[PDB]
Amino acid sequence: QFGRDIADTTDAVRDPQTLEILDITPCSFGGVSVITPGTNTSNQVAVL
Amino acid sequence: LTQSPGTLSLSPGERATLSCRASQSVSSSYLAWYQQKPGQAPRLLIYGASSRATGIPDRFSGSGSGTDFTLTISRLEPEDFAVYYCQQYGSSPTWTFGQGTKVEIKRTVAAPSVFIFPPSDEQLKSGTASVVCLLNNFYPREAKVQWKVDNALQSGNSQESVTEQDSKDSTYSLSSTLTLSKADYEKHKVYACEVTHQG
Ligand SMILES: *[C@@H]1O[C@H](CO)[C@@H](O)[C@H](O)[C@H]1NC(C)=O
Ligand SMILES: *[C@@H]1O[C@H](CO)[C@@H](O)[C@H](O)[C@H]1NC(C)=O
Fold first, then answer.
1. Which of A44, B40, B120, B135 is deepest in the core (most CB within 10 A)?
2. Ligand 2 mean position to B106 CA, how many Å?
3. For chain B, where do the domains classified as CATH 2.60.40.10 start and end?
4. CB contact A40 to B (< 8 Å)
5. CA dist list (Å): B37 to B80, B81, B82
6. Which positions does UniProt annotate with glycan attachment (chain A)?
7. Are B101 and B5 spatial neighbours (Cβ–Cβ below 8 Å)?
8. Angstrom distances, CA of residue B144 to CA of B8, B131, B149, B171, B179
9. Residue B66 backbone dihedrals phi, psi, to 5 degrees
10. CATH superfamily, region B2-103
11. How far is CA B160 from the centre of its chain?
12. Distances (CA, A) of B185 to B6, B118, B119, B145, B147
């Protein structure tokens, strides 16, 4: 009925009506680094 | 206010940056920028140190920080060839304008064609002289002019050399006039003009 990963969470599932097999990928996430010359040099920034 | 460079003369189609700079006498949001063609009332381009006014092309962009600020022109056009002013609020009482950086953007490169003119019968019978030396078809306005008889008369307090006229020939032009007595036309056996250009 379910697939499993190391964390004991669903890596995949079977749909209870259509019975096809769905992977689960977590929705995209990451850090938000701000690249800055010092404030004494400029107030401009880039974002990664 | 400081504004730089004193003229900005890059080719059309490029990116070109004007700067506006100040002492701590002024406040950071209230910078603005203006266009003036010859003899016209100025036109508001930028306000808020970065916002375009409505009806200004998206190729203009203002930016800055503290007391160092800029206007970048991009995708330059012959319509940009004008004097450009920044201005800033003097914190509360007073309004202060920049230098008026002439956007003398690249047209051609050329040395002057030259014509030289002695005094004439109507001018002399009217009791006067004025010797004329004419320069045209040049770019930039790199011109220097000197009067001679045939040694030197450029020391004369009555010599004049008007500001340069730009043209549909993608080039500047200018004139020097050496006004004199009719007795100078009787004195000097020849009149001449010499020109230095491109450096
Ligand atoms: C659920 O209903 C659909 C449509 O009637 C059918 O195709 C499917 O086989 C049913 N699944 C189960 C588990 O009964
Ligand atoms: C601070 O910035 C100014 C220019 O904005 C620079 O002249 C100065 O050297 C800087 N000082 C330090 C310690 O970063």
1. B135
2. 35
3. 2-103, 113-196
4. no
5. 9, 8, 5
6. 40
7. yes
8. 21, 17, 18, 16, 18
9. 65, -95
10. Immunoglobulins (2.60.40.10)
11. 17
12. 41, 9, 7, 20, 14
Can you list the pairs that A7-15 forms with residues at least 24 positions away whose Cβ atoms lie under 8 Å? Answer: none
Choose the CATH number for B113-196 among 3.40.605.10, 3.30.70.100, 1.10.10.10, 2.60.40.10.
Answer: 2.60.40.10
State the ligand closest to the CA atom of A14. 1
**Nearest protein CA to atom 2 of ligand 2, as residue:** A40
User: Residues with Cβ < 8 Å from B108, sequence gap 6 or more?
Assistant: B139, B170, B171
- Residues of chain B contacting residue A44, judged by C-beta atoms under 8 Å apart: 63, 65
Q: Which amino acid is at B124?
A: L
Data resolution in angstroms: 3.0
**B63 close contact with A: CB closer than 8 A:** yes
Give the method of determination: cryo-EM
